Amino acid sequence: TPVSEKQLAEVVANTVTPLMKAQSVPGMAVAVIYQGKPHYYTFGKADIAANKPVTPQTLFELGSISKTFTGVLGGDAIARGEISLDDPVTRYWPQLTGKQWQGIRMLDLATYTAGGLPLQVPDEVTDNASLLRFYQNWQPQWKPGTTRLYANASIGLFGALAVKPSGMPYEQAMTTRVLKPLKLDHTWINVPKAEEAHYAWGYRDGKAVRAVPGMLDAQAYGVKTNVQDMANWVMANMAPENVADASLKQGIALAQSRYWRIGSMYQGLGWEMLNWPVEANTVVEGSDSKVALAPLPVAEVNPPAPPVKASWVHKTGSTGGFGSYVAFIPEKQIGIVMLANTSYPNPARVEAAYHILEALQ
């Protein structure tokens, strides 16, 4: 169904406007990838009190969508020959001597199958000495490679260890190996003073808020970006054949590979996938925290299945004051980015995105 630019504009507006009013969303930046190019639509305010509108230059906090960058950076390191997903975690952290770590691979850290690592690294951890103490003391509730339990303590460590062989700190490795080659020049972990004027304000219970530190925060949920950079990020991931950097294109393919199957979903590195075609209720009913935070049994995909073009590839992300979502279908070469300055229900994000993409397929 060939939709015109005019009809596309109407499809987006008619879906986004009622959503924002029902969910009390202050502002939203949307990007739709259709017929080889990005289409931008901006709504509302970035700063309500100052009355600043949302523009394609407005910066939003990505939340867990930051994990897709971690997965690709890790994939790039594997493609360079620096690390292997089959290597034990201890190969990259010798001081981690606890015997409970035997059998736990880099793959397990990256895909939340280490055996029960908790959602977050505790507040007590304020340095590297205490970080080690935490992982050394941890006792697995399940055997490695049997149970998926979404955790920042898991993927966060994967990201920190994956960049060790390069000799660069995580931020520097991400900039040099992923951001720069893709020309994502307005994507930050640390927003410079010159860019603070573009930084949107997040809202929670009417209160204006913005992200604060941690330890493995950059690896798990510390990325800030505008809708233009995000659209290009989605384009590189849905069409890696067009990226020149050889290790990066392979890294993108590795992040979308299928390592485990959990019911109707498949776990990649950062990215999560479902076979296309898929109905909305399957995708929507899967985005509920009750199911998203639960420890679920996994089915090993061995060897890992390469990227399947007929897939619904996506990732949700939130912070105290922001709610974002990204979804794309490679077979159709269509995708969408929805960045907002309020954390509204994930099922609502999925429903809206599915509605828009359904009109383009």
Q: The tokens 């233009």 sit on which residue?
A: 228
Amino acid at 184: L
Residue 188: which CATH number? 3.40.710.10
Pair 242, 236: CB distance under 8 Å: yes
CB atoms under 10 Å from CB of 216, counted, come to: 23
Breaks (C-N over 2.5 A) in the chain follow: 212
Residues 6+ apart with CB under 8 A from 170: 159, 160, 163, 218, 219
End-to-end CA distance of the chain: 7
Number of domains in the chain: 1
Rounded to a whole number of angstroms, the CA Rg of the chain reads 20
User: Does 316 count as an annotated binding residue?
Assistant: yes
> 11 Cβ partners below 8 Å, 6+ apart?
3, 356, 359
315 among annotated binding-site residues: yes
Answer yes or no: are the C-beta atoms of 196 and 52 closer than 8 Å.
no
CA angle 143, 251, 229 (to 5 degrees): 115
Measure CA 279 to chain center.
22
Domain housing 10? 1-361
Q: With beta carbons less than 8 A apart as the criterion, state whether 35 and 11 touch.
A: no
β-pair type (207-209, 272-275): unpaired
CB contact at 8 A, 44 and 30:
no
> C-alpha distances in angstroms, 73 versus 238, 240, 272?
16, 14, 16
| Residue 317 annotated as part of some ligand binding site | yes
Amino acid at 31: A
Distance CA 200, CA 160 (A): 28
Under 8 Å between Cβ of 69 and 63: no
Q: Measured between alpha carbons, how far is 4 from 10 in angstroms, rounded to an integer?
A: 10
Rounded distance between C-alpha atoms, residue 148 and residue 168, angstroms: 30
Say how far residue 11 (Cα) sits from the centre of its chain: 26
Contact 216, 159 (CB under 8 A): yes
SS3 track for the chain: CCCCHHHHHHHHHHHHHHHHHHCCCCEEEEEEEECCEEEEEEEEEEECCCCEECCCCCEEECHHHHHHHHHHHHHHHHHHCCCCCCCEHHHCCCCCCCHHHCCCEHHHHHCCCCCCCCCCCCCCCCCHHHHHHHHHHCCCCCCCCCEECCCHHHHHHHHHHHCCCCCCCHHHHHHHHHHCCCCCCCEECCCCHHHCCCECCEEECCEEECCCCCCCHHHHHCCEECHHHHHHHHHHHHCHHHCCCHHHHHHHHHHCCEEEEECCEEECCCCEEEECCCCHHHHHHHCCHHHHCCCEECEEEEEEECCCCCEEEEEEEECCCCEEEEEEECCCCEEEEEEECECCCHHHHHHHHHHHHHCCC
Tokens of 236: 């590189």
Which of 216, 229, 131 lies closest to 171 in space, CA to CA? 216
What tokens were used for 121? 């690294």
Cα separation of 49 and 203, whole Å? 11
Tokens of 259: 């390592």
Which amino acid, one-letter code, is at 300?
Answer: E
Resolution in A: 1.8
Question: Residues with catalytic annotation?
Answer: 64, 150
Q: Backbone phi, then psi, for 178, in 5-degree steps? A: -120, -55
Pairing of strands 311-318, 323-329: antiparallel
Encoding tokens for residue 46?
Answer: 């970035």
Any idea which residue has 């339990």 for tokens?
A: 149
